[PDB]
Symmetry: D2
Subunit: 243 residues, 4 copies
Amino acid sequence: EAPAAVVTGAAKRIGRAIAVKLHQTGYRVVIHYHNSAEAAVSLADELNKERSNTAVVCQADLTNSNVLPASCEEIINSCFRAFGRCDVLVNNASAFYPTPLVQKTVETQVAELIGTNAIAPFLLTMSFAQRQSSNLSIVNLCDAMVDQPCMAFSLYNMGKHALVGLTQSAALELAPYGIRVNGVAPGVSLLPKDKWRRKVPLGRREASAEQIADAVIFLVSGSAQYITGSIIKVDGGLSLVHA
Amino acid sequence: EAPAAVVTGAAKRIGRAIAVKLHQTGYRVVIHYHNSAEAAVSLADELNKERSNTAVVCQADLTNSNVLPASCEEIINSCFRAFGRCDVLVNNASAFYPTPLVQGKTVETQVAELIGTNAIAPFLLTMSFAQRQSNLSIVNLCDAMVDQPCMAFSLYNMGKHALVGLTQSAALELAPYGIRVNGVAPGVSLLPVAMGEEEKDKWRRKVPLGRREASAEQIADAVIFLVSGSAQYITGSIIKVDGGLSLVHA
Amino acid sequence: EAPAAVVTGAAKRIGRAIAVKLHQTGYRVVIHYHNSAEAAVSLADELNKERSNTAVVCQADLTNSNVLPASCEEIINSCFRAFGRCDVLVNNASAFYPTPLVQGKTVETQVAELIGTNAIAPFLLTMSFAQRQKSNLSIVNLCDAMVDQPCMAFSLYNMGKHALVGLTQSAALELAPYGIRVNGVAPGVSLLPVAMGEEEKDKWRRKVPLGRREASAEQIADAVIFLVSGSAQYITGSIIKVDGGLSLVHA
Amino acid sequence: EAPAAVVTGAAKRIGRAIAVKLHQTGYRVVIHYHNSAEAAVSLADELNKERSNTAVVCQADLTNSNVLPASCEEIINSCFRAFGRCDVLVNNASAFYPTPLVKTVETQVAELIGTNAIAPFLLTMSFAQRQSNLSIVNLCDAMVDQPCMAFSLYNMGKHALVGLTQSAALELAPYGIRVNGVAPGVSLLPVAMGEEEKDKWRRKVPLGRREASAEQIADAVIFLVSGSAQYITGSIIKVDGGLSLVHA
Ligand SMILES: NC(=O)C1=CN([C@@H]2O[C@H](COP(=O)(O)OP(=O)(O)OC[C@H]3O[C@@H](n4cnc5c(N)ncnc54)[C@H](OP(=O)(O)O)[C@@H]3O)[C@@H](O)[C@H]2O)C=CC1
Ligand SMILES: NC(=O)C1=CN([C@@H]2O[C@H](COP(=O)(O)OP(=O)(O)OC[C@H]3O[C@@H](n4cnc5c(N)ncnc54)[C@H](OP(=O)(O)O)[C@@H]3O)[C@@H](O)[C@H]2O)C=CC1
Ligand SMILES: NC(=O)C1=CN([C@@H]2O[C@H](COP(=O)(O)OP(=O)(O)OC[C@H]3O[C@@H](n4cnc5c(N)ncnc54)[C@H](OP(=O)(O)O)[C@@H]3O)[C@@H](O)[C@H]2O)C=CC1
Ligand SMILES: NC(=O)C1=CN([C@@H]2O[C@H](COP(=O)(O)OP(=O)(O)OC[C@H]3O[C@@H](n4cnc5c(N)ncnc54)[C@H](OP(=O)(O)O)[C@@H]3O)[C@@H](O)[C@H]2O)C=CC1
Ligand SMILES: Nc1nc2ccc(C(=O)NCCc3cccc(Br)c3)cc2s1
Ligand SMILES: Nc1nc2ccc(C(=O)NCCc3cccc(Br)c3)cc2s1
Ligand SMILES: Nc1nc2ccc(C(=O)NCCc3cccc(Br)c3)cc2s1
């Protein structure tokens, strides 16, 4: 029928905006959630009321664990079950908090910050490609501030750098299969705050979630059919600003 | 009225595809050319038949000299003269040829053409664009292969690297005026006219995504996106349109 | 007294070359190893025969697990127990093998080994090195010049080396106030795999612009020596490629 | 036979520290200068006092023009005439001032692009054409991706120099000439800058809250020209105390 997209952490904030905009563009969507069932279903309700049976929810914890692989397989599968196909994977879900070097157990911090930020994308990518004319692509939510990191955010920063590596390695490896792999790297978007707004060259404010979603839409579209291994910054110039 | 765009080197190939698609999107266009008089006039005819009074040509050499600033000022002025505004500048015109370090143009001319067209003219057009100032934006045609350059293309590569610096510096400085500055970086696209065919296929086979070069239209698509209302928070960004080519090791 | 360095995976190859050159420069060294027990003890013996009580060994698996923190803590502790100080940490140990996306070991074991050795262990060692400080302190991470032009089907390895770049920057930033510098050395092609045939070796050699040959272990060690030296006292968050130009060559 | 090095803008500041350290290392040096004749000669006299006939001066404007090629060939020539060889080229000379988008503009172009990029390229061509541990070191800028406001031409020139470093490394590698860069962050601050302004900059540097000494920069240069960097080409070492890692 129409194409189908998986968006991880799609309940709230940036993932919800991505899900909505993909829907508005005529995708059927899987709304993945971990904790936010109420929010996920509510979003699903709003989209199905717009177009019948075009949105489903999918629960999974994306912490790294012996079961992460099974969870990731399940997320992809639920797209194939619901819609008979899977055209787009958006790796949006992400944990974010400090992990000081001069100081949750550390290994929980690893499991969340590397697991959800990098390992789950890699596993989802594997399942997506394993289960594959069409316009197949993956979009990873990266970070424009990766080379100028927040103090005491090493594991977070490590996970986002790993996600860049995944974007590049997967683009190279899946290109022969017609699967494109790209990234979108926000700066300051939806915040945890004017201190940070004032720093942004373009308009002294944060990106809306929808601005982020815009770039995703571009990358999934037929207007990006030659684009793979690209990461588009969406940061209003913040990463250009020196100390 | 409809917004207006300048596209440098717009008579042929990628610049032509960019002028077309901007036009098809509702822009009035200035078609800058240097030598390609016929092709320039032909394209402006084609666009004007489609919507009258939406296309002009403007002739200018973009080689570095003491009069390059006046030429660049003139390109921008031509947009204001024809359309009363200038919303979009596309820095597309480019000289490209080998300049080996170890050895019929002088080196002073090679510098003038490769650094002038690829970098200095962009800078001067940017200044003139900004001084004469909705959804204002500049798009520089960069090069996805700038960190893995062709052998013996040092001056070309230097110019393209300078264009990256321009993209970042002007993005930062023009942001408070609401002008966004971004780039599109092709890998291998429309292959040179004076090139073989076993040799075109050599380059084609290296491209991971589909073992082929980009169409001009595919490059133009990325330009359209960056000027569009969908890229309003995007500045200082360079989008590679290279089908994975820059990711491939030797 | 003499400064002391920990070098991970120092029994053979590049890690041995680094331990040896640090030793010749006047450092006491901890030779970490995992499986190469014979080669590690042989090296310590050699170094001790040159100046006694200047080399120890230290065994640890650097695979990710709930005990990796303790093992990384123990590596650093081994240096303080032998030498009374720890001045330099070289994160050299590395697992390296294909993990094709389109399909030995389970995937969770591949994650544990490639991400564990290449990134998580460096992070935990960095944390232990910093916390146990209580002079010229620095950390050197062995990165990869080819991280942005990766080998086909090495996604997990590439992810781990990219994470190590992030650690290098993040830790340089966070530890600079403590006087600890953090930098990286990024080989291109160096000591080829012991497994690889000569035919394949020469294919890779011919791609190197500077001399059509791989880096010697010594050449890699040379850059590490620079970064720990007083000649690099203002250098932090820098990653020096030692690749003969390989990363500049297009496809 | 002692090796020989050309250092551009060697009269003062960083280029002076580079020439001195190369000399201390055993090199004979051509001290290139533009305006600072007295400082250049005074350096040559000091070095020649240390070791007779090991230092000469060479005056040249590195602004872009129809004669820049000739000038750069003559700089390289002076090293061969003086010392019979040229082992090392250090592209250090640089103009630096703002060029806001909103002197004539073409003079700004000629000065900022000429000294920072064109003259390096022409010197590199002349160096290689006249040709063992041969290498070139370009003085780049650690902050090129986080530029000062209204420094576009300066920034463009320094990005061009990165391109040169990479392109020339690749192309000269077959002749055994290595090409590398050193990218300072904040080093010697202007003499005239008020201490209170210097301190705003110093405060931003993670490693020690101070600017690099000229000697710290020269140390990296010494490494890259040494036998300890024999496999290193196309590399750019930041010497910035972590400055480029600091967000807005
Ligand atoms: N926001 C910004 O300004 C910035 C954004 N980014 C990137 O943008 C993306 C989206 O950002 P934003 O919307 O703010 O993200 P959030 O931090 O709000 O998290 C997004 C969603 O991720 C899910 N998630 C978190 N941890 C886990 C876990 N362990 N297992 C499963 N799901 C989990 C949650 O779903 P649930 O609620 O259902 O539990 C959560 O709502 C991220 O990838 C982020 O790194 C980059 C830089 C800055
Ligand atoms: N084609 C490709 O594969 C790739 C292209 N690019 C970049 O994309 C852009 C467009 O590519 P492409 O269409 O191939 O470009 P072309 O090589 O076809 O050149 C574009 C135009 O630049 C103009 N130009 C050349 N020299 C001068 C000069 N001295 N003064 C004024 N104009 C001049 C010419 O105009 P006229 O004919 O009127 O004289 C020419 O048609 C360029 O910036 C290029 O560097 C990036 C990498 C790959
Ligand atoms: N060789 C090259 O061409 C290149 C090297 N590099 C990097 O340079 C560094 C050194 O390279 P090289 O000497 O070839 O490295 P090797 O592949 O030879 O590995 C070095 C050591 O890592 C240790 N190691 C492996 N897995 C584990 C583990 N699970 N737990 C603990 N230790 C482990 C081994 O110790 P043991 O033998 O005791 O079990 C091994 O001797 C690495 O970080 C590498 O990625 C980068 C690019 C190219
Ligand atoms: N200082 C710092 O903090 C930083 C420095 N750098 C880079 O480090 C290098 C050395 O820095 P620094 O010592 O501060 O440099 P300066 O700004 O002090 O300039 C060095 C020399 O360049 C020469 N020069 C300037 N314009 C010309 C010209 N038209 N023709 C010929 N020579 C010219 C001058 O020679 P004369 O006096 O004889 O006329 C001058 O003494 C430069 O390339 C610079 O960009 C980069 C990052 C920051
Ligand atoms: N004005 C112009 N600029 C450029 C820039 C690049 C090219 C081109 O053909 N680039 C291909 C470079 C390349 C480099 C390595 C592998 C492969 Br296949 C292709 C062609 C042009 S035309
Ligand atoms: N622990 C280890 N890590 C690594 C990492 C890389 C290599 C290696 O041989 N890399 C070379 C890959 C490559 C990529 C492109 C051109 C060429 Br000639 C060679 C070998 C090892 S062993
Ligand atoms: N020829 C010359 N080139 C340059 C280049 C840069 C500088 C300089 O002062 N750079 C520091 C810029 C900077 C930017 C942000 C924070 C901090 Br403290 C310092 C000084 C000079 S002098």
